[PDB]
Curated annotation (Swiss-Prot):
The relatively low beta-ketoacyl synthase activity may be attributable to the low 4'-phosphopantetheine content of the protein. Ubiquitous. Prominent expression in brain, lung, liver and mammary gland. This is Fatty acid synthase. It comes from the Eukaryota. Fatty acid synthetase is a multifunctional enzyme that catalyzes the de novo biosynthesis of long-chain saturated fatty acids starting from acetyl-CoA and malonyl-CoA in the presence of NADPH. This multifunctional protein contains 7 catalytic activities and a site for the binding of the prosthetic group 4'-phosphopantetheine of the acyl carrier protein ([ACP]) domain.
């Protein structure tokens, strides 16, 4: 079975990867070499080599090229792939999958050669049972990505030739989701690249962009390097600079996941033709609202969206309602809004049409719009840690978690935690030495 957990996931988050210890040590090391102008990780090795050849007046060329760095091991770096390893990537992909009119998804990657997202993305979408996916990986030059062709073949991915600088080929055409991974891959021009991408992007589609933000420690550290390749320098821009860039291409920001050190994951959507929305209270206890909703949905000729908003109680199951309806005919028009604060202290924002918050969410246009403790987000599914929980217990017995495999012998909590000492026939006894007989071996071996 596939095991998962159903949790609230705020749209905009900061300091995502604080918990990890390895990343913090990597950051401390990296800043150390930078200071005054040491690990198995690549980027620290690159910085050490850069500082090694000269303590001052380092050549851009020599640091640009060096043994053990010519490979695309930078994406293999923990820091550069950190947020991609987090649940942030799965959250963004789930948001992209949910907000699709149809059950099929056409996702095209730009500069797949260095981004390497092609390996990670298709696996993350295996849990979705009914989804059908069509991935294509594109690069500026065919000889790039000439390797790992077995890796592409084992999955269902398609090569590509689009150079983000120029307009996308009609073969790609309109696609639901575009993934770039600009962190390691270089974009020739921010404005032009984004313009071409949004052009290729269908209406109501998503543009998932992973980038390193200038104005942050790691951002400046990388900015010093890669001075030989001007393009990659253009791939580094300020957060406010990105915010300005998105507006220029009339692309609305829908999501943002920001790491403690600077790695970010922008999610922006291609605005759909504006249309008058319908608002139907779905809070009545008598369930009389069904008749009205059954009506509004009835007029299939119309194309206006429908917004089911419940604000009276935090126990409305409107999310499941919209999930089941979107599979029914006419359900594409449905979009939900739920205000479910788990703390009485937290205030309830006003969702009246006049209020700003409703305008902002309407601009978002996401199907699921849940508000909990002052943060707009949606429930998401996440695979749970494979490891079995352990607790400090004074009672435990040796058990074979897999019949016939002595490697599975482990200590498990016991029923003796609950016992009564009064009974003379009980005589609970502590154990200091226990013997193994032939029968125990026969049992364990199977």
């Amino acid at each position: 079975p596939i095991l998962e957990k159903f949790c609230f996931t705020p749209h905009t988050e900061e300091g995502c990867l604080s918990e990890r210890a390895a990343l913090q040590e990597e950051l401390q090391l990296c800043k150390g070499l930078v200071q005054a102008l040491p690990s198995q990780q690549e980027l620290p090795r690159l910085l050490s080599a850069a500082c090694r050849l000269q303590l001052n007046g380092n050549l851009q060329l020599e640091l640009a090229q060096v043994l053990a760095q010519e490979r695309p091991k930078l994406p293999e770096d923990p820091l550069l792939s950190g947020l991609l390893d987090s649940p942030a990537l799965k959250a963004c992909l789930d948001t992209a999958v949910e907000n699709m009119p149809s059950l099929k998804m056409k996702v095209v990657e730009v500069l797949a050669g260095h981004g390497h997202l092609y390996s990670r993305i298709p696996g993350l979408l295996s849990p979705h049972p009914l989804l059908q996916l069509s991935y294509t990986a594109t690069d500026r030059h065919p000889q790039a990505l000439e390797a790992a062709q077995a890796e592409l073949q084992q999955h269902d991915v398609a090569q590509g030739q689009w150079d983000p600088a120029d307009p996308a080929p009609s073969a790609l055409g309109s696609a639901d989701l575009l993934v770039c991974n600009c962190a390691v891959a270089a974009l020739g021009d921010p404005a032009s690249a984004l313009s071409n991408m949004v052009a290729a992007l269908r209406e109501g589609g998503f543009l998932l962009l992973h980038t390193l933000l200038r104005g942050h420690p790691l951002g400046d550290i990388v900015a010093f390097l890669t001075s030989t390749e001007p393009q990659y320098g253009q791939g580094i821009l300020s957060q406010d600079a990105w915010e300005s860039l998105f507006s220029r291409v009339s692309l609305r920001l829908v999501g943002l996941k920001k790491s403690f050190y600077g790695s970010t994951l922008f999610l922006c959507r291609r605005p759909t033709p504006q249309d008058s929305p319908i608002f139907l209270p779905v809070d009545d206890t008598s369930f009389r609202w069904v008749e009205s909703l059954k009506g509004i949905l009835a007029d299939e000729d119309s194309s206006r969206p429908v917004w089911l908003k419940a604000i009276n109680c935090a126990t409305s199951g409107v999310v499941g309602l919209v999930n089941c309806l979107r599979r029914e005919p006419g359900g594409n028009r449905l979009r939900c809004v739920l205000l479910s604060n788990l703390s009485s202290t937290s205030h309830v924002p006003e969702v009246d049409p006049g209020s700003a918050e409703l305008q902002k969410v309407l601009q978002g246009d996401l199907v699921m719009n849940v508000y909990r403790d002052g943060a707009w987000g949606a429930f998401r599914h996440f695979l749970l840690e494979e490891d079995k929980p352990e607790e400090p217990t004074a009672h435990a017995f040796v058990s074979t978690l897999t019949r016939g495999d002595l490697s599975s012998i482990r200590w498990v909590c016991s029923s003796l935690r609950h016992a009564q000492p009064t009974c003379p026939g009980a005589q609970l006894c502590t154990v200091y030495y226990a013997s193994l007989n032939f029968r125990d071996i026969m049992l364990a071996t199977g």
